TrEMBL record, chain A:
Family: Belongs to the rotavirus VP2 family.
Entry's free-text remark on domains: The N-terminus binds RNA. It is necessary for encapsidation of VP1 and VP3. The N-termini of 10 VP2 molecules form a cylindrical hub underneath each 5-fold axis of the inner capsid.
Its job: Inner capsid protein that self-assembles to form an icosahedral capsid with a T=2 symmetry, which consists of 120 copies of VP2, with channels at each of its five-fold vertices. This capsid constitutes the innermost concentric layer of the viral mature particle. It encapsidates the polymerase VP1, the capping enzyme VP3 and the genomic dsRNA, thereby defining the core.
Protein name: Inner capsid protein VP2
Self-association and partners: Homodecamer; each decamer is made up of two conformers of VP2, called VP2A and VP2B. Interacts with a VP1-VP3 complex. Interacts with the intermediate capsid protein VP6. Interacts with NSP5. Interacts (via N-terminus) with NSP2.
Source superkingdom: Viruses
Residue window of the full protein shown: 105 to 147 of 882
Subcellular location: Virion
UniProtKB/TrEMBL annotation, chain B:
Self-association and partners: Homotrimer. Interacts with the inner capsid protein VP2. Interacts with the outer capsid glycoprotein VP7. Interacts with the outer capsid protein VP5*.
Transmembrane segment boundaries: none
Post-translational modification (record): Sumoylated with SUMO1 and SUMO2. Sumoylation of viral proteins seems to have a positive role on viral replication. The N-terminus is blocked.
Domain of life of the organism encoding this protein: Viruses
Renumbered residue ranges of the record's region Interaction with the inner capsid protein VP2: 62-73
Other facts: The VP6 trimer contains a zinc ion located at the center of the molecule. The zinc ion is not essential for either trimerization or transcription activity of the DLP. Zinc-depleted VP6 has an increased sensitivity to proteases.
Species this protein is from: Rotavirus A
Family per similarity comment: Belongs to the rotavirus VP6 family.
Interval of the full protein contained in this chain: 1 to 133 of 397
Coiled coil: none
Biological role stated in the UniProt entry: Intermediate capsid protein that self assembles to form an icosahedral capsid with a T=13 symmetry, which consists of 230 trimers of VP6, with channels at each of its five-fold vertices. This capsid constitutes the middle concentric layer of the viral mature particle. The innermost VP2 capsid and the intermediate VP6 capsid remain intact following cell entry to protect the dsRNA from degradation and to prevent unfavorable antiviral responses in the host cell during all the replication cycle of the virus.
Record's protein name: Intermediate capsid protein VP6
Compartment(s) of residence: Virion
Amino acid sequence: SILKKLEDIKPEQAKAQTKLFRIFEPRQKPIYIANGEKERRNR
Amino acid sequence: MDVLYSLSKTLKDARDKIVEGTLYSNVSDLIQQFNQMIITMNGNEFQTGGIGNLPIRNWNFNFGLLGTTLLNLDANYVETARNTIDYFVDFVDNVCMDEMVRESQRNGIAPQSDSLRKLSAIKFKRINFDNSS
């Protein structure tokens, strides 16, 4: 009964990080001059 | 005290390095610091003079923000920058001349004029350009 429950414990798995943990990513956005017109070149 | 020096150094940098033709990448830090200084100093009232024969003057800080878009600086950019700079430097010089004309027999390390007294608050400690002098 409980023998299987207490004998079926395997060592805690060591995760293999497939990619770096990301919160921030680049995004291309338009800009305007101080007067308020398009600059025709995005940043 | 140190806040005043930071303002002075920033004002000198803005007065000097902002010239026609220079690459905008060379003053990106300077323009960001200048914009931060304008934001911090805007919307406050300061008074000067009142003792001896110093002309009492009143300053109100309502100003815009310099653009961060032009690839190469142009003439109107310089004229607006100098328009802000003249008022800022007049305020700095008047604050200094008001500070020089008041003394305290005890606790001389502390501000004496109203301007430096106001600038001692933690809110105005956002402008600490450098202390190279």
